[PDB]
Design a protein around this ligand. Structure first.
Ligand SMILES: Nc1ccnc(=O)[nH]1
Ligand SMILES: Nc1ccnc(=O)[nH]1
Ligand SMILES: Nc1ccnc(=O)[nH]1
Lengths: 283, 283, 283
């Protein structure tokens, strides 16, 4: 299924009928960081498998629902069960849900992820407001937009200079200051490693030399599809570990350790993003 | 359709019949830089769609013709409607037209493109004679030659040390000096970004650290196919903007601005390449 | 054919019946470095084409056999006819033979390759014990593990911090010292260039800036599949040429020159690896 105007429209038509929610904000949550979705009010849970033209996710298994409802007085749509490119999903499969969000009315997409810290200032449990990226798949002919352009959504050659909205980064930082956790909050450049192997020690050392502050396996594809169709983005990485320090100390990177950091910060991140949602401009 | 000897031969047989032109030189022109093709003498226009085994281009649409005729006393073949890998064309689809050029008798391929400037010396409207490249798709398992080798055209492992012919670069510079526009002409290393998103500000900053002088979304695949089958190459980038300066000044990159630079330099580039063609050696 | 548990089991069942050899060690040899396979004792040669679910290799042609037998008192299985990703083999085709090795009982995989030297200390004919890697395909969404995870073999997100076993590197160096060829032996980081074009002069210069010591077109995919399923790895590069020096001197890289270096060091490498095999721990 191509992520075109007709196919995205058919999915949005189904969702509009079944949900009766017109969302202004979209959310995609990192692993272990999805509990805000469980707290959506007046919520409507729509399995991906029920939505016309949504990507098939049964090979990977696990949860796959679109959840619509109200958070902090705003109407939102959430992806419960993120699609990651290391699973083998195509460019079309990644793009269609974001384009459906656009047709549903989403103007702002909020994204969280778990990432490795490269910059020396970053400790496990820190947050990084993403201000730019290095898209290794994109440089390497695996950009999420490779393929025919879908003109109804955006231009053939998008500029990414404003992919990460500055005002949204400023609002996120302001809320952290108001709640006295700004000492945890940094800003930085995200390197997209296609994955699914963690960054090797020597890849981490290369990323250090190349300016990269954090590395992870997601986010950049969704950012690009959103930017292409005019959706503003705030993307926040939770630092699971400092990969440069771990390489210096012969310490392994491990998904169980990553998820334990997610559990440690999950409630703070939920509170933060709920307040961001309530504070977003009405326009 | 595989870009093999039999299939390329079938395309060349059709072209030889319909055109009656045996070209010595091939040309592939950047966007907005194609007007020389409109000035080919005694010309024969062959739609790609009519040529056996040529790639289907109707999804992208727009023009797709092979144009044969005379420029500056030399017999040439031009691609009117370049095939770009960000459109989703396969390695086989990119390679077949160049291999057809080889079977038609092409010994020299002239290429122009529009690119972003990384080196600080580069201003909008400058020309860069490409002297080498950094092929991010190639490093990343998306080299245009991935797949079975077609032994009749070239070796399994081509060396790229002489992919950009030195004598052709020297001739291009000499003609610029004779016409007093050598102040516009630089030389440099081309980074291939698969695209189609423009280089992000942080990707540009990385390319600066990595020695790259210019960045763009084309050219390297054609250079490699030509080098593989023994065709000499001259490749010239027209600098649309300096991406490092634009990132420092929060200035966007935009295809309309790119095309306006192409329009500003199109006539000078046509005159330059016409003279290069007339001055090429007969052997 | 997916490189899953059922399919790998069917291949291993066939091999166990026909060979009567239960191997503890696997070997994959670089081009021109395969003569140890010819010296396997009590050997059983099994054409890939006869093994259920093994990848089809007839388009590339050339030899394709699994060879089982005894070397230095240990039971081994060798791939005679390596599968390279620049040929177009899929992730599944690369992974299945290594996973078959795992089901056959392989605990240690020994790998050799031919590579370009980047580090200035490296001369043609030197050996590099690989201690880490920079996986450009992996960063670029072409990691050998992209696709559904096969849980029976390993985790979704492997850590590569111990992909190159330290004790095996130490044993290899110790044997070189005992035989007075330690002056040829270095250690270093391997950059994976998908290929099949040799590293361009400017790619080599970039790799120098990025810490890389050697560059080649293989090995990293097999290392990752082995690491994913718990097989320890020793990987050794034979330096065919110093690409930085060759770029400084306008000297070409050439497969015939590469193979001549392989021939010059083939007998020493066979003796070295035979002794490594005899000296490997029984556990
Ligand atoms: N160290 C890491 C943590 C989480 N995700 C990554 O890709 N890397
Ligand atoms: N800045 C740029 C201009 C043209 N092409 C590119 O890829 N980048
Ligand atoms: N210079 C090289 C020799 C062998 N293999 C490579 O990839 N490069």
């Amino acid at each position: 299924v191509v992520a075109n105007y007709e196919n995205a429209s058919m999915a949005a038509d189904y969702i509009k009928r079944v949900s009766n929610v017109l969302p202004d904000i979209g959310i995609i949550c990192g692993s272990g960081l999805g509990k805000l979705i469980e707290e959506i009010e007046e919520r409507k849970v729509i399995p991906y498998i029920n939505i016309p033209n949504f990507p098939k996710t049964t090979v990977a298994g696990h949860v796959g629902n679109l959840v619509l409802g109200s958070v902090g007085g705003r109407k939102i749509v959430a992806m419960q069960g993120r699609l990651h490119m290391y699973e083998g999903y195509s460019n079309q499969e990644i793009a269609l849900p974001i384009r459906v969000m656009k047709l549903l009315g989403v103007r702002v997409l909020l994204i969280t992820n778990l990432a490795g810290g490269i910059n020396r200032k970053l400790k496990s449990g820190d947050f990084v407001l993403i201000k730019g990226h290095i898209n290794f798949p994109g440089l390497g002919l695996n950009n999420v937009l490779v393929g025919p352009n879908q003109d109804e959504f955006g231009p053939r050659f998008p500029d990414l200079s404003n992919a990460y909205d500055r005002l949204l980064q400023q609002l996120a930082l302001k809320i952290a200051q108001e709640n006295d956790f700004q000492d945890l909050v940094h800003e930085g450049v995200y390197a997209f490693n296609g994955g699914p192997t963690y960054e090797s020690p020597d890849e981490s050392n290369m990323l250090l030399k190349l300016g990269c502050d954090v590395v992870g396996m997601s986010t950049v594809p969704e950012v690009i599809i959103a930017c292409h169709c005019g959706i503003k983005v705030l993307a926040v990485s939770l630092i699971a570990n400092n990969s440069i320090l771990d390489a210096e100390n012969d310490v392994s990177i491990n998904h169980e350790k990553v998820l334990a950091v997610a559990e440690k910060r999950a409630d703070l991140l939920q509170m933060w993003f709920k307040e961001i949602i309530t504070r977003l401009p009405l326009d």
